[PDB]
A paper describes a structure:
Laccases (EC 1.10.3.2) are multi-copper oxidases that catalyze the oxidation of various organic and inorganic molecules (e.g., mono- and di-phenols, polyphenols, diamines, aminophenols, aromatic or aliphatic amines) with the reduction of molecular oxygen to water. Substrate oxidation occurs near the Cu1 ion (named T1 center), and electrons are then transferred via the Cys-His pathway to the Cu2 and Cu3α-Cu3β (TNC), where the reduction of oxygen to water takes place. 2D laccases are homotrimeric proteins, with Cu1 ions of monomers lying in one plane at an equal distance from each other and forming the so-called equilateral triangle.
Diffraction data from the crystals of mutant forms, excluding double variant His165Ala/Met199Gly, were collected at 100 K. Diffraction data from the crystal of His165Ala/Met199Gly variant were collected at room temperature. Combining Met199Gly and His165Ala mutations did not significantly increase the SgfSL activity, but led to a drastic shift in the optimal pH of 2.6-DMP oxidation to an acidic pH area. These results indicate that His 165 regulates oxygen access and participates in the proton transport of 2D laccases. Surprisingly, the optimal pH of His165Ala/Met199Gly variant was pH 6.5, while single-mutant forms Met199Gly and His165Ala exhibited maximum activity at pH 8.0 and 9.0, respectively. Apparently, in the absence of His 165 side group under conditions of an increased electron flux (due to replacing Met199Gly), shifting the pHopt to the acidic region provides sufficient proton flux for oxidation 2.6-DMP by the His165Ala/Met199Gly variant. In the present study, the His165Ala/Met199Gly mutant retained practically the same high resistance to azide ions as His165Ala, and the resistance of His165Ala/Arg240His variant was 3-fold higher than that of the wild type laccase.
Author numbering:
A (entry chain A): 40 to 319
B (entry chain C): 41 to 315
C (entry chain B): 40 to 317
């Protein structure tokens, strides 16, 4: 609800790749608690994260991150020998940095943004099978003073599924009118998609919010995305539109018909959702 | 011309009608339905009540992008805001100005290039309705936005422009110096790239740069997918002159198969060099 | 670093379309030196370029440019009769302009940006055969004060290939840690792609670098593009990540599996690449 602090901490987490039911694989922070999508990793600009990574599987797996600073030995590719053999262990190091003026007078961009990590080694040296099986997760890097949300939810279009779930099964998210909700939106696989939210909109820039009246960024409620794109935004749940079962879906028509649909359930402060009949 | 501040309450009648050969269109008067539907233009703060009547024998709905509306004007079967055959229904669209919220952040205004379309014909995503022609443009202006001399709507709907047969345009005319506004909407199954000859715009809300500090990329080509919408303004023939200036989808098989048209920019006498 | 001057020069260049091996076709500034992609053309806003064009092929060809100012007679299309006949010649003229205030108070965008040129006429009236055969290349228009790079490399996604090369053959690019490297990224053909670089990122705006702390442009390392899109950016090779063989690839999974992959080789000051097996 406040603002992101300045970074600079050194953080440590243990991560596991495990098989799940149905031929799927997931990352998790504790043995037996892997999920799809993987756990959310949140860092402030300047932080260093060491991932003590254990592969509990019987096939090689890796961890590759978009956006952040990492040396070649934390690449997560077979090519640079930064994959993890079955039963093996590896320490991955992710660094982040603040923006700032260089000596040549140019502006060096910071790490802040909506990013993601995924496998690069299962199935093919591009991770095609590992990604398909669920080896993916979100990474948020915040800049000093960024508005922090009340809740963050992660939406992944993975080929024809949302979060590797069966068609027509959400996921659904709940909020109360006035909550500041953050959506992390990641795409993977073979297909392009368009992400659409009923009754809400956002700015097409780093944070999803206009910086002020001078920000010329387009305001949208529909965004085309391709494999390994990531973006995020913050909305005020129900702002100007009120409570109800607000649909989000891919707007590619056949994807919508296949079941790439979910609900943003926005409740009144008394817990009620007007008009909501879940048999409809 | 500059857009004024909004705040007016407006009313319109809208109808859904069957058209020739399987098509469906929206109209503001009975018998006047078109594809694309009629252009709805609002200034931030305006409120629009759409008194809607379904004259067809199947259910139909009206759902809008970008604008403020309560759940009862969602236009989805899921929330029971569709319209039965022969039935009527008032949809209410609101708009708002930008402004600082109490928490200190900036609330985006409604201004932008938007669209409305059906959400229940064929499927509960409106696949059949959109295919048949139930879509149209919506422009919300901010106080002080530059107003054009004309506005043209280009809809890439699957493999057609505005549901027209291949190789039939549409073509639009202007005169050298005209301030021409383009609304560009995409629907259906396919991604597209929209491409203009002789002209370019900025990839931001209005299609024009705000000034020398605007870092937005200036482009003559834009990828777009189903339900994307954007717009821009150009001075017809600026720095390039009169002529028949192609626009087309730049996916090669789409241009070859007929997603092509002309922007006919005339000299003041009415002639178009080379055409 | 270097900075771009103001423009306003009138330049003249000769350009040829020639046949190459394997049914391919390319542009070149000297007979017998056509290449795919075609030669890089760099202008400063305000420059005028006259292209004295010669078609050495047996089919009509044309030169169509994006983003720049040109009259209908340099449009490069059959419908405007601005193609070039077999063995014919034609002068194409491209102009550019600075940004400025129109008399009505609105701001006129400048010509600066990452653009490209290509055929519009070989095979179909959209140039489908010409583009597939290799008739395409980069144009960079710079604005006064834009920072200049140490090196510019052009990557073109054309259908399922990079730069019409066979699958998995790169191209690979070399730099030394700290080099200011400029990438021009053009897409052509039938398919959408996503372009991804390992270890590096850029700003999604005109130059690929933030203007400063007020610039809200998304910073990205992955970008969707479709036929005839062009963008570009500059990076500092290895900045914050070090030397290594840094993969770039289309991130559409089947495309990377089929060979839309290449290497950005960032060398230590002593010319070696840690962990890289030549
Ligand atoms: Cu990556
Ligand atoms: Cu989709
Ligand atoms: Cu919608
Ligand atoms: Cu919808
Ligand atoms: Cu990746
Ligand atoms: Cu198309
Ligand atoms: Cu063009
Ligand atoms: Cu929609
Ligand atoms: Cu063209
Ligand atoms: Cu690709
Ligand atoms: Cu990769
Ligand atoms: Cu083109
Ligand atoms: Na932008």
């Amino acid at each position: 609800a406040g603002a992101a602090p300045a970074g600079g901490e050194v953080r440590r987490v243990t991560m596991y790749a495990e098989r799940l039911a149905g031929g799927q694989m997931g990352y998790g922070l504790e043995k037996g608690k892997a999920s799809i999508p993987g756990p959310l990793i949140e860092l402030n600009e300047g932080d260093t994260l060491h991932v003590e990574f254990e592969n509990t599987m019987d096939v090689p797996v890796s961890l590759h991150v978009h956006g952040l600073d990492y040396e070649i030995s934390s690449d997560g590719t077979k090519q640079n020998k930064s994959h993890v053999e079955p039963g093996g262990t590896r320490t991955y190091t992710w660094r982040t940095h603040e923006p700032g003026r260089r000596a040549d007078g140019t502006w060096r961009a910071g790490s802040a943004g909506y990013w993601h990590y995924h496998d690069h080694v299962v199935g093919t040296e591009a991770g095609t099978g590992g990604i398909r099986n669920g080896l993916y997760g979100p990474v948020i890097v915040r800049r000093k003073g960024d508005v922090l949300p009340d809740a963050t939810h992660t939406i992944v279009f993975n080929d024809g599924t949302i979060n590797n779930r069966p068609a027509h099964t959400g996921p659904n998210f709940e909020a109360t009118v006035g909550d500041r909700v953050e959506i992390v939106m990641i795409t993977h696989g073979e297909y392009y998609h368009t992400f659409h939210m009923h009754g809400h909109r956002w700015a097409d820039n780093r944070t999803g919010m206009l910086t002020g009246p001078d920000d010329p960024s387009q305001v949208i409620d529909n965004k085309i995305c391709g494999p390994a794109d990531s973006f995020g935004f913050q909305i005020i749940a129900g702002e100007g539109v009120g409570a109800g079962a607000w649909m989000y879906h891919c707007h590619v028509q056949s994807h919508s018909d296949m079941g790439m649909v979910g609900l943003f359930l926005v409740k009144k402060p008394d817990g009620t959702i007007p008009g909501y009949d879940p048999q409809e």
